[PDB]
Ligand SMILES: Cc1ccc(C#Cc2ccc(C(=O)NC[C@H]3C[C@@H](NC(=O)[C@@H]4C[C@H](F)CN4)CN3C(=O)C(C)C)cc2)cc1
């Protein structure tokens with residue numbers, strides 16, 4: 021009845037564009053051995069450069085989560101890391117032909133469909149969990165990010181934009197479906213920012229195909245929103261991706277108050293350093309565990 025590690029049953033290939041780069045990228049997810057973790061490969065480079073998707077390799081947090089090793093980056097990892105967190109994937113190689121993970125439709129939805137179509141493989145090794153034992157809070161200005169002990173996994177988030185088109189949601193993932201209620205929540209941008217962002221080489225691949233485009237009053241996307249609270253649900257999607265840089269699924273609660281990649285990563289570093297606040301645990305019997313995973 022032991023909760024076991026999971027990899028992919030089959031290879032997944034996808035094609036898309038970097039939100040930021042506007043570059044066409046070829047993506048391949050490969051099964052990986054027990055205790056590998058999630059490892060990105062820049063296969064376009066000779067030799068190939070691999071970066072474990074871990075907090076210590078986070079270099080940039082400016083309008084995406086960026087893994088860095090010397091002069092080499094992988095931009096915008098948080099949506100795919102979100103899908104792999106959501107579906108309980110411990111071990112995978114992520115091959116990219118370019119520096120940015122493809123944006124797809126702007127959500128984790130295409131990533132979860134492609135993975136679940138390929139299926140997952142249970143492996144003969146206990147799944148390791150990070151359990152929160154003490155409260156860990158970081159703040160900078162009016163922003164705030166907290167880990168709280170919780171016998172399960174749950175994410176609360178609040179944003180506070182002053183904009184007509186608005187901002188609080190809480191999700192317990194032993195009670196709520198990641199696939200149905202979170203994975204389809206798209207990234208969003210404001211018309212005002214897109215002009216400025218175009219300048220400082222950003223949003224080069226952005227469109228209504230991969231983002232909720234907002235002017236001063238309205239969503240411009242013809243078909244509108246997938247959820248009434250899509251904006252704050254996408255912040256939760258991002259936080260789940262960032263949390264996974266821990267390298268093991270969490271047993272605790274996350275609370276974001278206007279937090280983002282920068283302050284999320286501040287929290288990860290503080291938590292990792294305060295070893296009184298967390299422990300690695302396994303579950304030899306799934307039936308008594310606080311969390312549970314869909315059939316593989
Ligand atoms: C013709 C055309 C149409 C559309 C576009 C575009 C675009 C676009 C521009 C900027 C952004 C953008 O960074 N939004 C950030 C938003 C959403 C959310 N972050 C994420 O989703 C992260 C970062 C990446 F988005 C992926 N995970 C939080 N967030 C903000 O706080 C901004 C308001 C500053 C997102 C999309 C360009 C041209």
Ligand SMILES: [Zn+2]
Nearest residue numbers: 098207254258
């Ligand atoms: Zn996002």
